[PDB]
Structure formats: C-alpha cells, structure tokens
Amino acid sequence: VGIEAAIVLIAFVIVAAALAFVALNMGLFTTQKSKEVMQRGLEE
Amino acid sequence: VGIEAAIVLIAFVIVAAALAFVALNMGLFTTQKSKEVMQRGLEEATSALEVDGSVIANVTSGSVDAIAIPIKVSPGREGVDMSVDKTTVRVMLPSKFYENAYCGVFDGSSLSDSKLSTITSSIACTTGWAYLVIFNGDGDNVLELGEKGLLVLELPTPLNSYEEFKVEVRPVQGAALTVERIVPASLPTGGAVSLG
Amino acid sequence: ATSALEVDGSVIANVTSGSVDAIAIPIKVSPGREGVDMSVDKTTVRVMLPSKFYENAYCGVFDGSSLSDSKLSTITSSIACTTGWAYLVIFNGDGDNVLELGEKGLLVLELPTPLNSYEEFKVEVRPVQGAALTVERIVPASLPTGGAVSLG
Question: How far is CA B84 from CA B36, B168, C79, in A?
Fold first, then answer.
C-alpha cells in the first residue's frame, strides 16, 4: 500500500521540479528583456 | 492426522516469514530512496543563478573582443557547482554556434588588479574560451552565496556593431541562465564599453 | 518512476539557403540520477513533419570528443549515420551509451529539404524505460541566410 503511494509522490515531486526549472528560467529571461526594453525606451 | 497438519502449518509460517522479510527490506529501501529523491527535488527548486549587474565588453580596433557577464546566486543559498565536467556554456553568434565553450573556473586572486585587460590576459584556457572568475570565494569550484562571479568570453574576431549574441549557461542542477545583448552603435577605440 | 529525461535549454536550428536544415535539441536527465540508456537497439526517435511522418529516425549515439570544436556545422558534418538521421551527442561523459547525471546531451536531426517558414514540427523520443519526451516548436518568420537560428 505504501510503495505505490511513494511512487506517486516521487512522480509528483519530479513534475514540480520541472515546472520550477521552467518557471525560473523563463522568469529570469523575461526580467532581463524587460530591463533591456525599458533601457531602450529611456534611450529613445 | 495431526502431524501432517503441523508440517503444513510450519511450511506456511516459514513462507510468510520470507514474505515479511522481503516486504520490510524493500519497503525500507524504497522509503529511503523516496526521501533522497524529494530532497534532490527540493535542491533543484533552489539554486537559480542570475545576472547581477551590467554586461561589460572589451573592444579593440573598433570591434568587440571579450564579454564579461556578472552573475550571482539567487536567494536560498544552496550553491551551484561550477566544475569543468559539470557545467556547459553555450554561445550563439550571428554567424557561429558553439555548444560548449567552457574551459573551467579560476580563482579570483585579484591578480595584479581587477582590470578587464589583466583578467583577459593572465588567464588562459587550453581548450575553449569561456571561464568564470570567483571573487571573495573560499577557493572551491562551487559558486555560493557571498561569492561574486564574473564569466568572461574570449572571442577571436566576432562581434561588429549592432548584431546580437546569445549566451547560455547549463549547470548540472538549477535553471539555465539566458543572456542576450546587442552591441551599441558608439564604440570607443579602446577600453571597456558598457552593454547595459 | 525516475529517469524522466527533459529538455534543458533552447532548441537551435541550422538554416541554409533560406530553409531550416538541421535541428539540435538539448536534453538532460531529471533529478534522481538513474541514467537513461541511449543505445541504438533500445531507443527510438519519432519525427512528425508537416508532410512527412517517420517512426524511427534514430541512428545511435556518438561520443562528444569536442571534435575540432563545438560548432553546429562541425557536429552536423563530421558525424554521419549509415541509416537514419537523428543521433545524440554526449558531453562530459565517460564514453558509455547511457545518459547519466553530469552528462549533457544534444540530439541532432539532419533533415533533407523539409522545414520552410512558419510550419510546425514534432519530435518524440521513446526510451525503453522512463517517460517519452515530447518537443514541439515553430520556425520563426525571420531566418538568416546562414548560421544557427534560435527556435526559443
């Protein structure tokens, strides 16, 4: 009974880790691009 | 009549004991592995790594030669391993694409001083160009909180004016860092130029 | 349960004569170590094209000895496969045909005259153990006359 619950837990944790990786990567990229675009606006 | 019943009982009890032994052994192992995997997931959640400041480039003879990208670790400590065999740096150029230009991490002993020319000149890599320089570190190849890292590219005759470049870092654990900048129109004949 | 395999980074494509020729898909192993076998006889790669469908285009895994350098052109040119196109290139590996943690893999497609502008493609990897990886990207409008172009 416990073993399958542990397997499901492992799967759900692994899914969450991938979501976190994607979220941080894209958030950092979009923050950098926002910095660049507002810098360009100030230049303009 | 009783004796054979006792023998069957003994056999069935012995079978149950073996099943119990197997069940407890494998249950303990799988619980330990679940603990380890969720711990690793929590580790992967943190250790983001991010750009701290402005990218600064070296220009010689009217063209951009070297690029310095300042990075730091995100809140949450849990440092990122910057070893040669565990980290890969991707450089995407207008006419070139490089999958792995990482050569390693050399300690920032402050050299003679913190000049960009001194850093780009004293440090050399046997193969590849991109290396990372740690400041205020303890001498390890892991970037931790309290340590400032400056990642340097040595580019032989790329990067004229106005074209874009893309630099990506791929740690073994944590999110890949994406950096994209455009070279400004105004470039001095020498010295560092800020890329914003 | 473990050994998921996942995309690490951005898919990068090679464009020649105004059309996309080769596709590089960076992948890594998920947390939990427990590497994925990348042998020829155990892994199948599916490519779904707008006018074509291929069930198995995998030709094998060749070690990333860094060649002369890490150019996309050098990788696509030096490596050749007897049958099929898609191969995987391991970096920082120990020379085995298994992708483990600490090893970086770049899966490359050699596509003869598919992939104009704006049409979608689908790439799927089917390991013997672990979840199949699904990759779908769209070619951007702006393609240079040469060199690599990022697909995001």
Answer: 26, 15, 24
Experiment used for this model: cryo-EM
Q: Label the pairing between strands B130-135 and B102-107.
A: parallel
- Residue C122: what are its φ and ψ, rounded to 5°? -130, 130
Rounded Cα distance, C41 and C60, in Å? 8
Does the distance separating the beta carbons of B98 and C31 come in below 8 Å? Answer: no
Please give the angle made by the CA atoms of B118, B167 and B151, to the nearest 5 degrees. 30
Closest by Cβ to C8, choosing from B98, B127, B170: B170
User: What span, in angstroms and rounded, lies between the C-alpha atoms of B151 and B167?
Assistant: 11
Alpha-carbon distance of C22 to C12, in angstroms, equals 9
Token digits of residue B161: 């004016």
CA–CA dist A20, A15 (Å, integer): 9
The full length of chain B comes to 196
Instruction: State how far Cα C32 lies from the chain centre.
Output: 22
Question: Across the interface, which of B86, B166, B168 has its CB nearest the CB of C102?
Answer: B86
Tell me if B68 sits within 8 A of B139, measured CB to CB.
Answer: no
End-to-end CA distance of chain B: 94
End-to-end CA distance of chain C: 29
User: What are the distances in angstroms from CA C128 to CA B99, C43, C77?
Assistant: 27, 6, 29
Distance CA(C119)–CA(C139), nearest Å, equals 6
Q: What does this entry list as its resolution, in Å?
A: 3.5
Please name every residue paired with C24 in a beta bridge, in sequence order, or none if there are none: C12, C108
d(CA B30, CA B16): 21
Candidates A28, A31, A37, A38: best to mutate against B (most CBs of B within 10 A) is A28
| Count of helices and strands (H, E) across chain C | 1, 13
Q: Which amino acid is at B141?
A: N
